[PDB]
Amino acid sequence: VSLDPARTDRPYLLGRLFAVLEKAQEDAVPGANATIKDRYLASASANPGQVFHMLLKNASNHTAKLRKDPERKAIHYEIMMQEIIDNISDFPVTMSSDEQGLFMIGYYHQRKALFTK
Amino acid sequence: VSLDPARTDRPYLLGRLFAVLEKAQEDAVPGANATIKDRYLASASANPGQVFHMLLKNASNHTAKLRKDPERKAIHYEIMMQEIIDNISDFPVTMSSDEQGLFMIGYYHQRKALFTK
Amino acid sequence: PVVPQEVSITRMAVTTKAEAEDNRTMGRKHIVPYGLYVAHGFISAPLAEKTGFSDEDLTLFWDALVNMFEHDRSAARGLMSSRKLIVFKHQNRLGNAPAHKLFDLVKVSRAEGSSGPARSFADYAVTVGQAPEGVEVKEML
RNA sequence: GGAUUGAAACGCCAUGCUCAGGCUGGCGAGUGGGCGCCACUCUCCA
Structure with missing residues (x-):
């Protein structure tokens, strides 16, 4: 039992997306006291459409920044975003509690994978 | 300890998760009134699918609280959380009276293991 | 299903001779965000x-049933009120139908706008069927 | 095709665990703390 690239359930996809935004941010800005996780974990799971919209602004800004320097990862992450955001039809305003459980699994699963290598 | 780290039985896993959560919380906040057990034991058993996702919020907050300090155990717990959850495909809705018993077992074995030096 | 919650409390002062010597004490509260309840009853001649x-x-x-809650306010009680009341009256000293059949005429379900967690009466829809000939249904109470 | 101190031999009919009772009254997470000091996109060809 591990990460399934084919689950195609919306709250699972949202969890994966969250996890990889965390990872990309990490590489963006070293040395931060607090991660986006610590800041937004709860909110994200309660109000998808609310926040998700917001975060992508900053992510855009960052990837804009990061092309100057020769270093890359971040093109793999931009592709990973672009896959998950194409599979997600739309952003729910809110999720049933039981669904907020499944969101945690997609996050953890995805994280572990990225934890490797 | 009698703990079997390769059982992979869902209720057993759940119980281990519970125990680890409890330990984390305990470490976070010395001098607390009571334990997680005391507050949420019943509910967890009753409805695993509704409570675990709330527990994991607080877990994060505790970890955050901890890690900033030289007592960076709390990184070690998070890795276990990763490992445990990894094996789980989804949360149950309901549990039989039988797996409830199993659930307990897992809890206890893990508890003793943590308390080992 | 319901999900009970718990919260924490400070305190100015100390009741007893706590000479150990800020926020001097903890306390707890137990609450329910929202919930809707049903009940059944009978009367025998x-x-x-x-x-x-x-x-x-x-x-x-x-009258007591209609106005029960209004005089019950307390610290812990929160906000409670009654919503509906339906009365079935048989036409003779011994009923004309089984009870379980009557209670089945009332049905409760989610409104169209389900939207995940329920937080108001508005989230629900209530409907009542039509009774057999020997039973009289009055619901406007 | 006389005879195992034997050959035959019911434990049986039937009986409410019952009437009823609040987990209650109420309590601040709060006083305040600089992300700072300084750094060339620069040296060629109608």
Whole structure:
């Protein structure tokens, strides 16, 4: 039992997306006291459409920044975003509690994978 | 300890998760009134699918609280959380009276293991 | 299903001779964000004949049911109120239908705008069917 | 095709665990703390 690239359930996809935004941010800005996780974990799971919209602004800004320097990862992450955001039809305003459980699994699963290598 | 780290039985896993959560919380906040057990034991058993996702919020907050300090155990717990959850495909809705018993077992074995030096 | 919650409290002062010597004490509260409840009841005439329970008492009972909560406010109680009341009246001293059939005429379900967690009465829809010939349904109470 | 101190041999009919009772009254997570000091996109060809 591990990460399934084919689950195609919306709250699972949202969890994966969250996890990889965390990872990309990490590489963006070293040395931060607090991660986006610590800041937004709860909110994200309660109000998808609310926040998700917001975060992508900053992510855009960052990837804009990061092309100057020769270093890359971040093109793999931009592709990973672009896959998950194409599979997600739309952003729910809110999720049933039981669904907020499944969101945690997609996050953890995805994280572990990225934890490797 | 009698703990079997390769059982992979869902209720057993759940119980281990519970125990680890409890330990984390305990470490976070010395001098607390009571334990997680005391507050949420019943509910967890009753409805695993509704409570675990709330527990994991607080877990994060505790970890955050901890890690900033030289007592960076709390990184070690998070890795276990990763490992445990990894094996789980989804949360149950309901549990039989039988797996409830199993659930307990897992809890206890893990508890003793943590308390080992 | 319901999900109970718990919260924490400070305190100015100390009750007892706590000489150990800020926020001096903890405390707890237990709450329910939201929930909707149902109940059933019966009345029997043969037993009433044995005690004299009469009509005026029945009217007073209806009134008590309608206005029960209004005088109950307390710290812990929160906000509570009654919403609906339906009464079935058979046409003879012994009913004309089984009870379980009658209770089945009332049905409760989610409104169209389900939207995940329920937080108001508005989230629900209530409907009542039509009773057999021998039973009289009055719901406007 | 006389005879195992034997050959035959019911424990049986039937009986409410019952009437009823609030987990209640109420309590601040709060006083305040600089992300700072300084750094060339620069040296060629109608």
